[PDB]
Write an enzyme that holds these catalytic residues in place. Sequence first.
Site, PDB file in Angstrom:
ATOM      1  N   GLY A   1      -6.245  -4.821  -0.332  1.00 24.17           N
ATOM      2  CA  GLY A   1      -6.141  -5.353   0.837  1.00 24.17           C
ATOM      3  C   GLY A   1      -5.056  -6.525   1.298  1.00 24.17           C
ATOM      4  O   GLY A   1      -4.933  -6.800   2.525  1.00 24.17           O
TER       5      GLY A   1
ATOM      6  N   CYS B   1      -1.887  -5.439   0.982  1.00 20.89           N
ATOM      7  CA  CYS B   1      -0.737  -4.812   1.390  1.00 20.89           C
ATOM      8  C   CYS B   1      -0.250  -5.287   2.994  1.00 20.89           C
ATOM      9  O   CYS B   1      -1.089  -5.562   3.771  1.00 20.89           O
ATOM     10  CB  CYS B   1      -0.978  -3.575   1.368  1.00 20.89           C
TER      11      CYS B   1
ATOM     12  N   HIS C   1       1.881   3.532   4.192  1.00 19.45           N
ATOM     13  CA  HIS C   1       0.815   4.015   3.567  1.00 19.45           C
ATOM     14  C   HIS C   1      -0.835   3.741   4.317  1.00 19.45           C
ATOM     15  O   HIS C   1      -1.563   4.138   3.828  1.00 19.45           O
ATOM     16  CB  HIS C   1       0.942   3.526   1.985  1.00 19.45           C
TER      17      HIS C   1
END
Lengths: 295, 294, 5, 5
Positions: free
Chosen positions: B141, B143, B41
């Site tokens: 932030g 991920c 993503h």
Amino acid sequence: SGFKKLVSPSSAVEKCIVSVSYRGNNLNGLWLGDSIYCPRHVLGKFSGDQWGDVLNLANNHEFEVVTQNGVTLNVVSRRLKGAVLILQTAVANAETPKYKFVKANCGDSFTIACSYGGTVIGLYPVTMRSNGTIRASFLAGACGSVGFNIEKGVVNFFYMHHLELPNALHTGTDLMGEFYGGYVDEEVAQRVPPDNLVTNNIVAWLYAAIISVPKWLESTTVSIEDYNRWASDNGFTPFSTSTAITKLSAITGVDVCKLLRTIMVKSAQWGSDPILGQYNFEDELTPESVFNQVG
Amino acid sequence: SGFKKLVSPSSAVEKCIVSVSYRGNNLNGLWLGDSIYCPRHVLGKFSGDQWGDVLNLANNHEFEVVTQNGVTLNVVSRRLKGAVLILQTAVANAETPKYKFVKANCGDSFTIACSYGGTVIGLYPVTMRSNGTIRASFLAGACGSVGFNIEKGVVNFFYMHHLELPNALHTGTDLMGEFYGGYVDEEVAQRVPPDNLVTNNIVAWLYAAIISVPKWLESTTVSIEDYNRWASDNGFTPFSTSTAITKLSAITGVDVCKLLRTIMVKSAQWGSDPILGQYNFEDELTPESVFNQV
Amino acid sequence: XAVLX
Amino acid sequence: XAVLX
């Protein structure tokens, strides 16, 4: 979002942990600059003025100190600082991080680098209790393990492990050599003051519970002066203001006095309403840590 | 002695965490050998087959990979493996540790390296729940943050963080790009099966409670067959044999079947006498961790 | 309902 | 009582 009892990363600290050996005696040490810090009981089981007399009669060559490269360090001097032995090394730790020796106040939480044979095998958080102890996990050979945290690029060392007190309680000294709670490095019956639930952390936990959502929250307030009067007779530490708690209060719009009142009620009779899945207070999560986990 | 939920030291993992940015999207990557792993993503919010097409239209130089030393790693190739993007670099991580990509099973506990901007800011333990989620602590932030442990000198990578589900639940993929619990990297509603308390860990905890010192220890035994029959209908995972549990049983001289009985009894009504200070089962202390602390 | 970190 | 580690 979601709250956890964090532990500080360990890379910087791992580079400072070494093994210290004296006449078959083995434990851990902390190497910063050209100094090696470790429990003085690495010399044996003594008491009172016996230490020092023993240190003066010891030789520097009998101190076997190895790093994690397998590099043996040569000792060139020795001194006692409280219950802490300091061995000066010929060579200085080129990887000494920016650090500071800090004394942990009741309620303060930090990371324990659980070490054996100069090697950190695991880490976990602990909180300095009101009676000067920590609820940790240590086995034989873990002495010298350090407690620390990392704040704004600086490694704060608050603790060095020395001994186990009845009922799985641990204690030690700050890096200045002073024993928390006034205990002594001697295997003898020592009175351990009652452990008080840390109000400031409970308050942090309650705000985290609120932030994450309460029907368990009290609407009536109690004053700080009164709460502390009550806290004195019910096994809780006094409440003291902190910039973090202030921020938490501002974030939720919930008066800290209502949380204090909530603590009073839940304390007498918790009831069947759980808080974050529990029916007992969590007091090892700090205001600082909860604030950090919101934004 | 004391029983705690330990986290693995992080020296080895810290050297592999890197910053990955693409068209303004920045998150964390895992740098092993000449490969960088991170959530797909990072390419944007897509779905279905769009991912492959989007990656085909992307340029390797659009991917900004930066080490904690401030070194930019040029990307020479890119591909998708499940929901994980793998970027190959010309430069290899000289500090790659011995590692292995492992899929965590329900009840398995590991360490999360909570990361932001390519830097590990803290660590904490988590347990893979029966529904494929973990109860963690992540903000915007985070991920790409990884979950791991260290066994016999090898770093086992179990998880990479991708998303937050309602009720503070977190999930992601293993390092093979496969999502736990069958969730997807899309901001849409997703069903989350009920969380089943982990029996094997609860047993480990009760053994810890025994060792640390009980009035709460039931005197009767319940067969593993009956307990499992019961568990399947009361929100508990099945009890399964394990060496650590057998050693704990051996240390205390208490049959696991009595702890199973204790679980059934207190599951219906705890009343009071607390176990290790609480009135709820601790579910994330594993048999191995308890044994290791004895 | 899900939020991508 | 107390024990040195």
